[PDB]
Design a protein around this ligand. Sequence first.
Ligand SMILES: [Mg+2]
Ligand SMILES: [Mg+2]
Ligand SMILES: [Mg+2]
Ligand SMILES: [Mg+2]
Ligand SMILES: [Zn+2]
Ligand SMILES: [Zn+2]
Lengths: 576, 576
Amino acid sequence: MLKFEIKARDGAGRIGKLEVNGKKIETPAIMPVVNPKQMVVEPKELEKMGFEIIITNSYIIYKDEELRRKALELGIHRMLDYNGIIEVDSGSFQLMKYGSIEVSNREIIEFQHRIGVDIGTFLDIPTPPDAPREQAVKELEITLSRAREAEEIKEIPMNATIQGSTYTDLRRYAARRLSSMNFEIHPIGGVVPLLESYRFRDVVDIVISSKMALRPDRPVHLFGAGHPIVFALAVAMGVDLFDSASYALYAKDDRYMTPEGTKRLDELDYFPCSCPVCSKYTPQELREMPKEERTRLLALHNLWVIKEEIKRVKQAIKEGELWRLVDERARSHPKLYSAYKRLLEHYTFLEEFEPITKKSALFKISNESLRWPVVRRAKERAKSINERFGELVEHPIFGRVSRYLSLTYPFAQSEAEDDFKIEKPTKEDAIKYVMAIAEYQFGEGASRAFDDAKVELSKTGMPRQVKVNGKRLATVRADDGLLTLGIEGAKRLHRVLPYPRMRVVVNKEAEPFARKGKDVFAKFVIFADPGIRPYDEVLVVNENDELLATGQALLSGREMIVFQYGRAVKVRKGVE
Amino acid sequence: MLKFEIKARDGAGRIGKLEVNGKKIETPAIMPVVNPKQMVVEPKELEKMGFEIIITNSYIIYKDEELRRKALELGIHRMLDYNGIIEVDSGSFQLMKYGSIEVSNREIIEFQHRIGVDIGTFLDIPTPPDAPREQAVKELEITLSRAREAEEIKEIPMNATIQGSTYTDLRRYAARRLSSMNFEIHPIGGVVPLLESYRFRDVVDIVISSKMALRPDRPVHLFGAGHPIVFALAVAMGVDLFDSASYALYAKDDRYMTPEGTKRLDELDYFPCSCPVCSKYTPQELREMPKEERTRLLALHNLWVIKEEIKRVKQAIKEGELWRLVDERARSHPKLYSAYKRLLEHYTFLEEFEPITKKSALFKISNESLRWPVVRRAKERAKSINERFGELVEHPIFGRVSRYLSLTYPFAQSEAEDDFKIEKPTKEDAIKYVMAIAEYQFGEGASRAFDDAKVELSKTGMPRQVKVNGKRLATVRADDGLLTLGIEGAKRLHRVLPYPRMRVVVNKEAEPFARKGKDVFAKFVIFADPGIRPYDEVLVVNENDELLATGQALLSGREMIVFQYGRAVKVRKGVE
RNA sequence: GGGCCCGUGGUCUAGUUGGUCAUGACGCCGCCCUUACGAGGCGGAGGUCCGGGGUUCAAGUCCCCGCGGGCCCACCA
RNA sequence: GGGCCCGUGGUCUAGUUGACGCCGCCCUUACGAGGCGGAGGUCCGGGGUUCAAGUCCCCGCGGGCCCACCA
Ligand SMILES: [Mg+2]
Ligand SMILES: [Mg+2]
Ligand SMILES: [Mg+2]
Ligand SMILES: [Mg+2]
Ligand SMILES: [Zn+2]
Ligand SMILES: [Zn+2]
């Protein structure tokens, strides 16, 4: 009983709405790991700060006498004075470092119900990296079994943590076994050793391998990752949740955090921040004060950056610049740049979830910029249109491109050293632009659903509304020069394009509304064209392939088929 | 009457100590342009904030009745309640926009003495960009004349503004004419139109052309540049001062500033900041309030980032990562990336001022990282060593390098995707390392000054102190694997290296001290090997080439010969 | 369906003639500046303003109707 | 000439219950980097404290920061 819906999206990640026991939050989001005995910062304020969710170690409490009781006494919220979403850890992380931990998967799994938590974790086994073969195999099974045993003894939302070591094949498997099982969240675990050793590439090989085999709808949390240096990369991998003692742990050893890396106080002459701590202090005066005060103020600051970067990321996603932000943070350190270069290698993975159009332009600002999904796509997607229509124009990013396409995303919406001069149509070809924009936007074929049409030009010279006889097939949206279908056009297309091309099939229950014009909700989608990508102009149909309406996709096809909460299409017009 | 000394340095820029009228400040540093009549934020606060210096438009004053008087009345500081360094503008900028401004170069150059300012600017003429030819020539002469007329009627420190339009040939000339003239500061002007049109390339072409022909000792200020997006770039070009109404001007139009570019309030979902305004508010909430309060808060914010980035930069310089921060900010926007790629093209300009060793390692984080000065040099500088000594090992950044060099900056102090495994010497080789580190560090030759020596190995296996018979020629400094000369060694060298190889020539006056071991001050250097680069291990000598001491250069050779304030060498041992 | 915005390629506005509002937008030719790309600078000429209807001596510009586009809230049936 | 620090490759420590060197297995395209177990050298040089010292204070020989003098 955990709700998850994709609010906005970019890259392969997304900003979502998460609901557990009435308490809502929004992802991406990081959970500050807190060890109750000795709290550097009390939930009291974390909450006051912005953290509407955190995490503690249940197992560490099960051991302590005092808390065990205070626990079963006033729940956990009350015992931490935290009125936000609280989640716990099995203590497997403790089983990784110190090895032997005393408790049964069941004992703790149960112990978590009594303490009245909001989300819990069964005792998964975090095998380390480069671990021997069988040790990964055998250990994963034990994990999978404890995951089954926990599947049916559970009553609260639970984390099904994907283990598998440095073995992408295992990761892949333990991913489908756990995706098909009935759990609410999937954290990718046993990576801290990697992160501490800045093995950002191996981490991505892992996070990718997994996000591929997991169900799109369940939240992915990267276990033990709380440094601003990874968020942008991570999030664009389709990660949504982070947890880490990083902030306090760092602060203790006198380390300062920057989205670009780590700084040793006794190496700071200035404060590369503007938060409340670096505002009223200095590296000199803060190096003066003693531990108790020094680490507290550091942790404090660390939290502020952590928080800040996260907002930074979300903002990037909201604008459609997540990749530029990764390309920027990638420069923060060699090992991470490596990783980024590697992420960009998994085209197929990223392509699937990469929006078809964004709000802000494509920016050529690195060699890597040219390997970004949205580029590769358009280069191939435009290949055919170029030959059929021809009349090419030079492009700073794609080299050559048919003028007919020259005003639609990402061709006209790109910026690079040298500038791209677009070419407005001329009455006589105004159509070929549409035909092109159509075969490009809808697929080898679409052209025909517009064969004979009329293209109006605005006071600028831009191809806008296309209509036949008296009614409009579609409109060349100003922003990105793509086509927004207008019912009549939808129909005209549906006829020219074979099924399942660009279609969404809604259950009988929903069929009524679609016809009217009301939006479609993920839950009611029986199946939809796989090649559907976010913000695609799509055809709503009934199980019998009868046009029901046209709108704007909000999820990849494969995505609507599995989401239960959230909207699938933002219906423009209804067939009735 | 204005002092300027290079505190710390990197790239081609540096953090310096600037003193005018007893009031100290530190560069890089930005001065908020303020228009008295309607002040969005009063100096009162600006100073409270961190701005120990600002600027206003004297010509704007001379026109207004009220102010002209209040001006001649209680000076300027008092009229602005500002107790920091105040500087003014001639109004030429107003001569550019609106064209015709009423006043004589003399009239206002004198009106600036009366109002009792700390720094002033004569009426230079800011020719725009791509302006006709003569219009640039003719106009620059008028500027240079006004600069002569003001050279002799001046009593207060003044800004010698380099004009010249988009003509690098004129820029370079107008730079020598004004470098040789008696002025305190040189702003590079008539660039705003460039900056507003994000022509970051053209700006570099200009800033570079000029920094080349200007005297190293006089501070360079980039007229009208106040956006975080340029600082790292600019500063690494050897700029030291900025001024801009940017913050209030943007805030007015509802634009928010981020090190990476500009954001339109009504496009913000979150606040990618941690300052005092983005902390206690939200994009939603701030969009609600009206102008009076919206603009003020934004301006306020803008100031916070501005300040922030500047610190960022200085920190960068202090650790020796200025370039990494440019490589990062370069990704902020296409046109800027271009510019950066271009700056990196002038190797000879940058190499001269490029530290011989830095505190933090070299980072391979982009294709551009491989064109950074520090690498090109090393690859060439290492060329011969590799042939002579041989026994090469592969390197992630330089491909191949002889082991004997493998522990010396920046080979062992480099980080890139794949890692470099160093090679500690073996007693029998121990020396070849030094010999190598020698010919590499000092020049084709130096090897001999160590021909027969003893290399001690630490508890690590690292070659550290080298001595012959009983005394130490030098030591293999731990952090960078370079040689720190020990007087005996210095003379050993001096003898095998022809003049002026790595020599610093001191005025008779200073010859005394040198011998003792006290540091050398720029002022008393008659001449020094040009191939001298900061943090180079050098030989101090007297006008007749007698070894007087060994130290640590702090300026490129050609730099010592010109600097009056500031120290030239950090003397280690004296010959006496 | 409920609210607000719009008639639109993108990029972007930094040495504040007091703040602010104008001084159209597009397209057409020439000189400059450019390695030509680019991006600017200067001067010429005078066409068009998605459709329909009013208002005014004057209408891209001011309401009004239509055909369109974006954001937000509501419907998870 | 003072005051502080150190005896040193870089990088780096994010689901909070001494060092360098030597051989083998695992994980790695070998690189990288790790994970496991065997082995047990030397720890700038001299003098001490100790049953025991790289480890603790003393002197030597060295590196680093800050502050002072622009003569
Ligand atoms: Mg579904
Ligand atoms: Mg001199
Ligand atoms: Mg909506
Ligand atoms: Mg000093
Ligand atoms: Zn901070
Ligand atoms: Zn802010």
